[PDB]
Amino acid sequence: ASCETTVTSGDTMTYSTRSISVPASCAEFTVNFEHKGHMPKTGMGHNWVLAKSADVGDVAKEGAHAGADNNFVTPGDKRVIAFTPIIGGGEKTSVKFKVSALSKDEAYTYFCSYPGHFSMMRGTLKLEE
Ligand SMILES: [Cu+2]
C-alpha cells in the first residue's frame, strides 16, 4: 500500500524499471525521478511523461517541437496525464497525480519526450486492483 515509487535514469536511454504498478487503493500516486548520470540536460536530459499507450506517438511528435523551455511537452496537451520537467545529471524531480484520472479500461505508457529518446525509454503503467 505504498503510493510512491522511484524511477532512475542516467547517461543512457533506459529507465531503471519498465513496469510501474499503481495500487487502486491509493488516492494519489507519486513518481520520484532521478538522473544519476554526469551529463547535463543539454544533450542528456530526461523526463517522465504518462499517456494512454495509443497517444504516445502523437504526444512525442508534437512534444519534440515544443522546445526545451516547454520540457518537450506541448503546452496544455490534454493527452498527457502527468509529466515531470526535463532533468540533467545530478538533478531530481517528481510528479504526483490522482489515481482517479486512470481507468481500468485503458493501457498506459510512460516515456521520455526529449528528442530521440521515446523509442527505447518507455515502460508500462497499470492500475492494480
Ligand atoms: Cu530521456
UniProtKB/Swiss-Prot annotation:
Superkingdom: Bacteria
Induction section of the entry: Produced during growth on methylamine.
Transmembrane helix listed as a keyword: no
Segments forming domain Plastocyanin-like: 1-129
GO molecular function: copper ion binding; electron transfer activity
Location(s), subcellular: Periplasm
Gene Ontology CC annotations of this record: periplasmic space
Keywords of the record: Copper, Disulfide bond, Electron transport, Metal-binding, Periplasm, Transport
UniProt: Cu cation binding residues: 46, 112, 117, 121
Cysteines engaged in disulfide bonds, as pairs: 3-26
Major location (coarse): periplasm
Pfam families, A to Z: Copper-bind
InterPro entries in UniProt: Azurin, BlueCu_1, BlueCu_1_BS, Cu-binding_ET, Cupredoxin
Function (record text): This methylothroph organism uses azurin in the oxidation of methylamine. Iso-2 is probably the acceptor of electrons from methylamine dehydrogenase.
PANTHER family xrefs: AURACYANIN-B, OUTER MEMBRANE PROTEIN H.8
UniProt-recorded name of the protein: Azurin iso-2
